[PDB]
């Protein structure tokens, strides 16, 4: 394999971390290939769940806890801390909240969160690499509680970063927020990509095509598929009661991605940097509720 940039995996990985038996597990947790029965039963369907009040309560809870766990990771971002160390803290913080870390054994994903440094677009596997000053790093968190998943991510600066890094991270966040602002009943899912690409393209950045936002509730990933690029063929119309993510990945160079031999790590083909932000959203009559919002600060960590 020819690596596309400077990053390399840093092995070996510590043995899989156990989740105490008292924590409720998703179906895939014990499947040998980490396949999800309930997700496969819906493969290729485009119908979107309309959540009940019980569902919405369960989603509000798990999204709040997920935000708590992401803030835990945020507090650890400094030079010299390894992504494995972040994952360990994350793992323990999920368990302390009586939550299962959704990524763990999801299709055999080996860790409890995804850590995506620099040219890694998404699905970076926490490993022995210490973070370096100048790095940007996304941590993507998903928790499972009482049958519901809650999903968010932010990109962080490691010490002082260059102007390009600041512009990429700031722009990606703006893309996400401009998309969220358009969310309300009656809006087509395919419209969000028009908004995101319009802002990224205006700032000289490109929009990853191979990975999209997704429905999430009793399933980790489900309908609707939510592309982040312009003129896409996403199926469906927003309705009060829908829950889904918007999670744009934006790149310094071209949009093209490829996957490391580990089967997971998605990297830019040109080795240039990529950044990402994600919220889980509930569509309401007036617009939408940001279920994974920070509660005690107005801003994402990179600007606090
Ligand atoms: C964004 C994303 N992330 C992961 C993943 C896997 C391991 C760890 C973290 N994330 N896995 C994903 N999908 C796995 C395959 N399953 C599905 C199911 C439904 C859909 C959708 F299109 F949204 F309906 C997409 N993928 C996706 Cl879409
Ligand atoms: Co993912
Ligand atoms: Co996520
Ligand atoms: Co997501
Ligand atoms: K990245």
What's a concise summary of this model?
A protein binds at residues 123, 221. This protein has 304 residues and is α+β, with helices and mostly antiparallel strands.
Description:
This protein is an alpha+beta fold and 304 residues long. Helix 2 (53-74) packs antiparallel against helix 3 and helix 4 (163-182) runs antiparallel to helix 5 (191-202). It has 5 helices and 15 strands. The chain is 24% helix and 21% strand. It has a single domain, classed as Creatine Amidinohydrolase, CATH 3.90.230. Bound molecules: the ligand Cc1nc(-c2ccccn2)nc(NCCNc2ccc(C(F)(F)F)cn2)c1Cl, cobalt (II) ion (3 copies) and potassium ion.
Bound molecules: the ligand Cc1nc(-c2ccccn2)nc(NCCNc2ccc(C(F)(F)F)cn2)c1Cl, cobalt (II) ion, potassium ion
What is the first-to-last residue Cα distance? 39 Å
Percent helix, as a range, is 10-25%
Structural class: alpha+beta
Number of domains: 1
CATH-defined superfamily = Creatinase/methionine aminopeptidase superfamily
The helix tally amounts to 5
The total strand number stands at 15
- By CATH, the topology is Creatine Amidinohydrolase
> What's the overall geometry?
globular
Looking at the overall shape, the CATH architecture is Alpha-Beta Complex
Order of helices and strands: HHHEEEEEHHEEEEEEEEEE
Main sheet: strands, sense, barrel: 4 strands, antiparallel
What gyration radius follows from the Cα positions, in whole Å? 18 Å
Query: Which CATH first-tier class would you pick?
Result: Alpha Beta
